[PDB]
């Protein structure tokens, strides 16, 4: 059963670098290997079959190289576009089998989220529970301090993060932080606040609205 | 255009048998061999097998000779694969492909079907409008209290696409899912209404949630 190794699955490059995806067979495969790329959204495009030959509507900042055990995937000048992850495929021997992965994270310039503050719904409200949303729009990089205060109380452990994948066009990330309260709790205090500390910010911005 | 439209999310019992569907378009279904791929929740691809649609002769990985059984049906033009006595293990995405000759490739890929396997109820989501109390405005919609993943979002039928972020669904001590969808809009462009579409197929939940903007 033959085993595909892509040793570096994380790999961080600049728009316009050339970047190297690397590939290696527990035994030869006689360059029966094939490489695709799955976007964030989980569709999979082939790039390149048999080793080198670019598989058509593919641009030729792909190529691919290599021989016996040791295979590489190639993009000569990075675009926004090319976030994603890259398999590796031999089919040398059956089972087919492919590689661990490489997702390919995107170096741009430092942008600031802008920020916005959202209070629960009453239609969430009159069955028990305040979901309040702080929202992270459109930074670089991903590494981002959101902070609850509560009429100006800092919180812990009633938060949960979530964060999109890097944008194609403008390899940005945004975040959401939901803080859950009970109603009643929700209902104990005036001013909710986040507070967004990251790079592209000289100082920590704070959004914030009053209940009643 | 070439096309390989999947059957649609399936939550399905321990022990249970599902069959997975995979109608073909653009292309004679009897010239090219179809291949099944599963992909675990942050994981790589494992080859599950393939069939030839001429005769319906079929390969399989030997660790998948127990658990899946393709199948074709020539006049619908459609493949399909059946997962036997289902555990956690067999939660995943399932792809087909088409096999092309140069030397052979997976040419094209299907969307994927999510299975998930599990003891635990269907639970459509409750969506909720967010809505704030600078020369860009946001809104949005929370999706709460939902299982199993997933859901697909849009805004106002598929009519708005740019500005949107919709967020990755998180698993929540209660074991439901939730996840925010969001719009940004330049201040200026007031014209025009924000609907959001909640599709969870499990639950046959289907939602339009207009976000009130309260500009009077």
């Known amino acids: 059963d033959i085993q595909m190794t892509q040793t570096t699955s994380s790999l961080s490059a600049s728009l316009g670098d050339r970047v190297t995806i690397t590939c290696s067979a527990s035994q030869g495969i006689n360059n029966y290997l094939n490489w695709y790329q799955q976007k964030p959204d989980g569709t999979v495009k082939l790039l390149i079959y048999?080793?080198?030959s670019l598989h058509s509507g593919v641009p030729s900042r792909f190529s691919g190289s290599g021989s016996g055990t040791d295979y590489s995937l190639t993009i000569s000048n990075l675009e926004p576009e090319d976030i994603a992850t890259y398999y590796c495929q031999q089919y040398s021997n059956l089972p087919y089998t492919f590689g661990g992965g490489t997702k390919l994270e995107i170096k741009r310039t430092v942008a600031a989220p802008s920020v916005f503050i959202f209070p629960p719904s009453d239609e969430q409200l009159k069955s028990g529970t305040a979901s309040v949303v702080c929202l992270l729009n459109n930074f670089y990089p991903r590494e981002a301090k959101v902070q609850w205060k509560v009429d100006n109380a800092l919180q812990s452990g009633n938060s949960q993060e979530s964060v999109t994948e890097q944008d194609s066009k403008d390899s940005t990330y945004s975040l959401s932080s939901t803080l859950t309260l009970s109603k009643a709790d929700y209902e104990k205090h005036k001013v909710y606040a986040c507070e967004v500390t990251h790079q592209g910010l000289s100082s920590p911005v704070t959004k914030s609205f009053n209940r009643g | 255009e070439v096309q390989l439209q999947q059957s649609g999310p399936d939550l399905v019992k321990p022990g249970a048998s599902v069959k997975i569907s995979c109608k073909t378009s653009?292309?004679?279904?009897?010239?090219?061999?179809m291949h099944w791929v599963k992909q675990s929740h942050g994981k790589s691809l494992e080859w599950i097998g393939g069939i030839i649609p001429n005769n319906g002769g079929t390969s399989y990985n030997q660790k998948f000779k127990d658990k899946a059984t393709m199948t074709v049906d020539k006049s619908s033009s459609t493949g399909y694969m059946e997962l036997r006595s289902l555990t956690s293990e067999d939660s995943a995405v399932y792809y087909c492909?088409?096999?092309?000759?140069?030397?052979?490739?997976?040419?094209?890929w299907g969307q994927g079907t999510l299975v998930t396997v599990s003891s635990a109820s269907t639970k459509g989501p409750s969506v909720f409008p967010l809505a704030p109390c600078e020369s860009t405005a946001a809104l949005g919609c929370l999706v709460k209290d939902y299982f199993p993943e997933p859901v697909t979002v849009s805004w106002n039928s598929g009519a708005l696409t740019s500005g949107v972020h919709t967020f990755p669904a998180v698993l929540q001590s209660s074991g439901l899912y939730s996840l925010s969808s969001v719009v940004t809009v330049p201040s200026s462009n007031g014209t025009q209404t924000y609907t959001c579409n909640v599709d969870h197929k499990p639950s046959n939940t289907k939602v339009d949630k207009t976000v009130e903007r309260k500009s009077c």
């Open positions: 048999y080793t080198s």
């Open positions: 492909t088409r096999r092309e000759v140069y030397y052979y490739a997976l040419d094209y």
């Open positions: 653009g292309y004679t279904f009897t010239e090219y061999i």
